[PDB]
Amino acid sequence: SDRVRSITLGNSTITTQECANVVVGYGRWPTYLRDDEATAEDQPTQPDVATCRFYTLDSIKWEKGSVGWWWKFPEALSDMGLFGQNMQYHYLGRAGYTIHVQCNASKFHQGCLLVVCVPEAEMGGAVVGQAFSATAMANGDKAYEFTSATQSDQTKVQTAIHNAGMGVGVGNLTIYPHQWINLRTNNSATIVMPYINSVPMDNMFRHYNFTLMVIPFVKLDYADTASTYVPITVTVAPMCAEYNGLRLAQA
Amino acid sequence: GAQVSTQKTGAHEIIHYTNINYYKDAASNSANRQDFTQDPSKFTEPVKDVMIKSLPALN
Amino acid sequence: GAQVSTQKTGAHEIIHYTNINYYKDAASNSANRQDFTQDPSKFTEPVKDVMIKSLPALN
Amino acid sequence: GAQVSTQKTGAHEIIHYTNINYYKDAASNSANRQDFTQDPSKFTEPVKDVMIKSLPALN
Amino acid sequence: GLPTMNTPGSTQFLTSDDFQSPCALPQFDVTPSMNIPGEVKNLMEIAEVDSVVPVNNVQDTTDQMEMFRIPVTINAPLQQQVFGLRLQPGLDSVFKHTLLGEILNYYAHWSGSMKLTFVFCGSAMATGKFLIAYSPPGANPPKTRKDAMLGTHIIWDIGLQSSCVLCVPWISQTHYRLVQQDEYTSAGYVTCWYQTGMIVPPGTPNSSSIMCFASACNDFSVRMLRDTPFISQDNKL
Amino acid sequence: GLPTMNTPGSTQFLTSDDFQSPCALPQFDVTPSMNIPGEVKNLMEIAEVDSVVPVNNVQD
Amino acid sequence: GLPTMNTPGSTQFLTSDDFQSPCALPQFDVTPSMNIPGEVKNLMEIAEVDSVVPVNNVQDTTDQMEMFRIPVTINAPLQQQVFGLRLQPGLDSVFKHTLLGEILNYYAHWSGSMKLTFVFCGSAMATGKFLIAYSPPGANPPKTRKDAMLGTHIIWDIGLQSSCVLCVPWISQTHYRLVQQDEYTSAGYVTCWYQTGMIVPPGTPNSSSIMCFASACNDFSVRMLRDTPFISQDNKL
Amino acid sequence: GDVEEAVVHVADTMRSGPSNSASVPALTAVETGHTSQVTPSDTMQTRHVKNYHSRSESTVENFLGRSACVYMEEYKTTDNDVNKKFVAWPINTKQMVQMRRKLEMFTYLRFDMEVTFVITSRQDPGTTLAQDMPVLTHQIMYVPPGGPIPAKVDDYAWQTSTNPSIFWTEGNAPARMSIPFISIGNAYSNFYDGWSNFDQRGSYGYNTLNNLGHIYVRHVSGSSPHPITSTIRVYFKPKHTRAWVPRPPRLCQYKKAFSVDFTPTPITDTRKDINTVT
Amino acid sequence: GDVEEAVVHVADTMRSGPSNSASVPALTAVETGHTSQVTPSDTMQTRHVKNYHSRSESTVENFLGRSACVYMEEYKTTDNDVNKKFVAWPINTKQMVQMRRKLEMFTYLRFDMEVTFVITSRQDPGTTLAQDMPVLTHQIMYVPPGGPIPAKVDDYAWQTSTNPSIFWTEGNAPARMSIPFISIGNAYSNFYDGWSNFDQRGSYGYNTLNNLGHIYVRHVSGSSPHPITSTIRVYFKPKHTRAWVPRPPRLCQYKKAFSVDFTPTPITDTRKDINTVT
Amino acid sequence: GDVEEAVVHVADTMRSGPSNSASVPALTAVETGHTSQVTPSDTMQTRHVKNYHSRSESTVENFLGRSACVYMEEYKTTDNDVNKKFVAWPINTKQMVQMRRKLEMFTYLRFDMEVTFVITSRQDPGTTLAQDMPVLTHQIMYVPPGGPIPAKVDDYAWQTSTNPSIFWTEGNAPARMSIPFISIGNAYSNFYDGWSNFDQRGSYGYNTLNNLGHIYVRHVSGSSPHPITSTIRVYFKPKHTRAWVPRPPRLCQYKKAFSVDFTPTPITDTRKDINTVT
């Protein structure tokens, strides 16, 4: 059977018994930087099993009225294990990611989720012509919630779900690497995202490489059961991570 | 140092043109709009395991 | 990639000209008004059975 | 009497151009900005005795 | 010097010309190229990717996300219509803003076949059958399942495989069709009807939803680059 | 550049000239050709076909 | 004559063009060439030569020559800072007017490593050790020797060899950096700290001075020729 | 291969002498729809003649290979009426009678097109004419079907990013370009005996198949203190042409630009009697 | 070697007959993120068709290979306000909506640039318009980042010794040139989800990466007795282009030239009901 | 032989590992006047890097291969003052500051010259401006040292028989030509630390070696009823260049066109203290 997959990174393993295939970015597997593309001169560090491992972020609740959530990386993992320490102590970084989302329910539940990774997911503020701080869009590993109605508070991003906070049709997100979690036949989605950027390396505290979004296209529904909510959990594992430019640790 | 290549035409109807470069910078050349290679697999089949159309998608 | 061909002249009086294409689209070429093939049979003899001029048209 | 030479381009991306001189004076030619030879020794190592980087500068 | 004579069109500025021009930064050294993942060499590659179609435009959608879900129910009057739409990928409101309609709106002519994929997002214990039919152009669209069945159609059975594909063939009198479609270049209709009905066991929701995905086949193509009408401005930004 | 001198007739528009001009729709794909019956390549072919002559022009 | 059509850009005067033109003095005989010593074929050769850096810009220098000397003393509080400066070769006042900054100010982009050479100009009997460190870009510059040591650094021992070289490596996210540097293209900081302190025997001066020399490595380069902003005029000379 | 090397004459008379036989070339039967192929040598004695005449000038390529005006129009640089300061012409070849008749001799055509634009300007009369204005500039814009259409001279649509356009300055040669075969079908159709709807209702005639687009022209930024009027002429020149199914030339005068409507006309002129030859 | 010699078609339908087997090409699972590769031959009987259509016009090179206006601006030959007699434009492609949307369909781009300048002049209205002025001349100056910037029309900075410039006279063809790939990075970025400072503070968005320079324009020495106004239009034409990571086209109208701010918009238009097809 | 066929990159980093030995590349002695040749690989561990950067744009040929203005001047078509109707400029490169500083970075230079002339005209203000004047024409005259010099616009010297000259009409492209290396010595000298007389008296500095000649400009025959003012700009563009003995760039502002006189200037700007880095 091809419906069972096992993934092993470092000292952690992920086993799924009802999973779809695995999506690999744009057909490109993560790899280390080549000699003829590098620009920095000093030797890069390559913590391997220490940084490359699965790290489970906090879990969320899925209710009948949920609208969606998003996470920004690597700011989500900025304070997770030795990966956060390496980010803090280094000026440059580079790594691919493997994203796994878990969501299980009985055969009597119905619903559908869209899992997509959006590189360079620039977002606009609620009030056009008014800036927002670096807290309405990333504050660690906590999830940020979309809104059904138009956002009105000026200190946060426009959370209109149908526009996805990017001024584009929410239904056209299929272009990016993505997967669906249909409760009929699937419980989890796996995406392998290589390093995508315009430069060989970049600072992981100043730049958000990509954004992860989970949007329920078909709202959850059930009847006559003792389960009131369906938890969702997200797991991420850096791959082929390397750093450069050691310095004092960013506060 | 003159390049001779075919020019666009129809299915069943000297279809040659000559080009010469006058400047020392490649940025001054004309558009190279004669390339027609494409591959949609990167966006249509991003899966890891190859799936055959005839066989069931799952199991 | 230069084409040399004869140009129109009289019966008993270097009658050559050179042409080169500069554009990548065949629609940009000059008119090909040097073709003189014609066949009036399609409109003058549309009958099925061939009729000989010398013999009677019918019977 | 036409000179064919390569034109500037990038690392991994017909890169040829033709030049002809029309005037009888060499001063009328275009700039010869395609020379890239350099030697900083005249200003960086004007010493008489050669000094090895690894060994001590003096004694 | 060499005798010459200027022909008509000299000193004109054509926005779609191909001529060499002098370089303003001679002997400039460009940054070395790097193979970023996900290179696109043709807009058709984008055009072949699926996208969700907002079929439920009922003029009373207080929630925008409701546009993407096609309602379904138990105890459905026998042989009922699920949905009906006109096949104008570049003009009809349904396909106007899709990932495919956006691409076609930059062109004037199009040709080739299309793919419509339907996915059932109900309970695992639910079951049913549906008839999806494509009706070529005609003087009247179908009004019953008996009329619909006469054209190209496929019987969809809901089971472990949650998705079925309806391939719309390219049936036309001309090699190409106008994006701004009219009566002359009409393309037909697409409709879905109940085949057996939806049956659910006790302790399950009484309603379900379906979603549709639209994309182009490998024989699709476009032509005549025009400017899209969806975007406009009144003053300089 | 190359020395040149314009001759009389430059910048004139002659309705029966044969010159190349840029294409406004580069790399356009034309519809495939089809051999429709009854192709005419010379007006003389039309000229050789019979036609009824109105000889009885009696003004009445 | 030969049919022709003029393209856009004809009759324009571009200051960076390369075209042939007639000679106003035909068949002129030029003076024979002579190989004068010291031919320069590239501005980089000039750029690679050392020059004194005016590090002591204390806003209270009544004597201009004092700008070139870095003070040092005996009985220095342990782990003290000797000097600190920002690494902006083309923008910072320290490197602005140096033999290297002048060259960079004629360009817009630069890349490569840099060399900083320090020479001790104290007494022959004096001795000491110094720590010189380069801190890549960050949210905060170092404030103590413990913070400084974490980055690239070299321990300098004063002896018969009176000069030591700190090679600043090229660590950047982009292949090039702007001469008009900003927050995005910041380059870091350079600082010097006491390692052991300066000790002198009886009958010697209680103070000494140090000098710094700046130059470019063999992998340095520049790009985009621009006009320098250091020189201007108000009326014709 | 720096070079690549790339005389039809009308028939010749042949000598004929006296004849007496059962063959009767002169007698035929038009009922078959067949045009007789008899020659003067078959009905009288003739000498041998070598004819060097050629039918080169009668080819369709040369017959249709002439530029002809198809549309004129005037627009002012400044005026109170917004619609009067620019032109908007739906493309069609039925506007000018000469070219319309020349094209309508064939049922189907397939050719490339060469378009030339002639623009002239004149200063409008008034009580005060003294002014100084630099050379004017004009923009020609082509909008394929379905594209946005400008509503005023200074509309945003004039920032063409995909629509081809030409900018031309007075005093230079007329603008020129080429257009390929841009028909959805396999050939242009001068006539269409059919309807638009499938139930035989709606538009009738060749108006149903005209979906070529529009052409817009304006002054780029010229706005004189006093009005100035400009006129543009469009010339079409078929190239690489092919024709099918010839049809008789029209006899009645044209009366509509998008219909075949006409008034009955006499077949030809009259004379005193059938024998009058003077 | 005086000469050096230097046809892709869409797929063809293949004949298909009746089938009855366990294979089910029509059935798939979109949950995998994989787009079905089914063809009409797999779900119905089809004839053999040879298709000659080509996707030549859909290539990115042709799609982006059109000149589009990016900036307009007016400056007077003579006026009391010094700042009104010349233009100073920071280079950016976000000013015009059509080209902005066309470019924003991709995340990263790498191309050469071809810049064309269109300049027109008109004489301002007034109570006295009679004057005689020879042909005007214009200077276009480009200042890379960090270079000196002129503060007036007759400033010393207009004596460019290293900064490229063009001198153009009215009545001739528009000015034109080429510009290479001048990005510090390996490719232009239309979007940048990041900040300027390392502590996640300061400027946000693509405004942080815009360091292309400025463009200045003036009348060389023209100073008429009466005011004359001139307008300049800048056109960009990418060449030798490459794109990565396509993204969905924008839906909401633009509102800022240096931000993604927008207002929520409906997904699409509505109709009477789900069954309405008329 | 109809054709005749006619990539230097900066150094590459090499991998370096830990080291512990008596060699001390970091330690040197600047007293020798020798600049250290150390590389980052000699003081820290480094990876292998292939660098494709090139120093093409830093060559002297490209650095000095840009046209720069060197002289401006105004002359009127008609005026009461005879000396005001024509220009007389002694050739020298010390007039404009930018080009002067660019040239003064080297002691000796040897190059060909390319001269371009930009001429513009404007009609002077007055109480009556209405007039009609055909296109103007200008004459540029070069007088090598010792030749006759005109004293008025209509002098006999304007009949050049050996002195080269150019006649130019407004509305066409700017005039252009080439000039060879015309120095009596083996190379131009930007500086001359010496005197004119043998007893160390007389002129001092580079003014002694300036014997290039003069340039004269006039209106050929234009004489308008009302004054018209014209301006000429001269641009120099070295070609096929060679330089020797580089010298530090100037720091103080220029004050004289034929002398090195200056005012003392601070070495550079100041800051709060030696430790300030913010």
Ligand SMILES: CN1CCN(Cc2ccc(NCc3ccc(F)cc3)cc2)CC1
């Ligand atoms: C129904 N009629 C059939 C004949 N057809 C003739 C015709 C063919 C081509 C054109 N092209 C006009 C044109 C469009 C754009 C452009 F840039 C230049 C020219 C017009 C008429 C008319 C319709």
Ligand SMILES: CN1CCN(Cc2ccc(NCc3ccc(F)cc3)cc2)CC1
């Ligand atoms: C952050 N945006 C990324 C996209 N980039 C597009 C762009 C690329 C090149 C130019 N060049 C302008 C130009 C500069 C000098 C010159 F001589 C001619 C043209 C502009 C925009 C914009 C920034």
Ligand SMILES: CN1CCN(Cc2ccc(NCc3ccc(F)cc3)cc2)CC1
């Ligand atoms: C003493 N200075 C040394 C440097 N030298 C620079 C220089 C070189 C050549 C010229 N040529 C001017 C010229 C003369 C005649 C002509 F037709 C065109 C240009 C000027 C300066 C100046 C003296």
Ligand SMILES: CCCCCCCCCCCCCC(=O)O
């Ligand atoms: C600056 C180049 C000017 C070229 C002028 C036209 C070509 C003249 C030579 C004939 C073509 C042969 C070129 C070649 O040898 O490749």
Ligand SMILES: CCCCCCCCCCCCCC(=O)O
């Ligand atoms: C864009 C083409 C420009 C052609 C310029 C004139 C021809 C120069 C080359 C001499 C002719 C040889 C052409 C050939 O090799 O077929």
Ligand SMILES: CCCCCCCCCCCCCC(=O)O
């Ligand atoms: C005054 C020179 C005019 C040259 C005109 C263009 C070149 C024509 C000849 C073709 C190129 C061959 C030149 C050669 O034999 O080297």
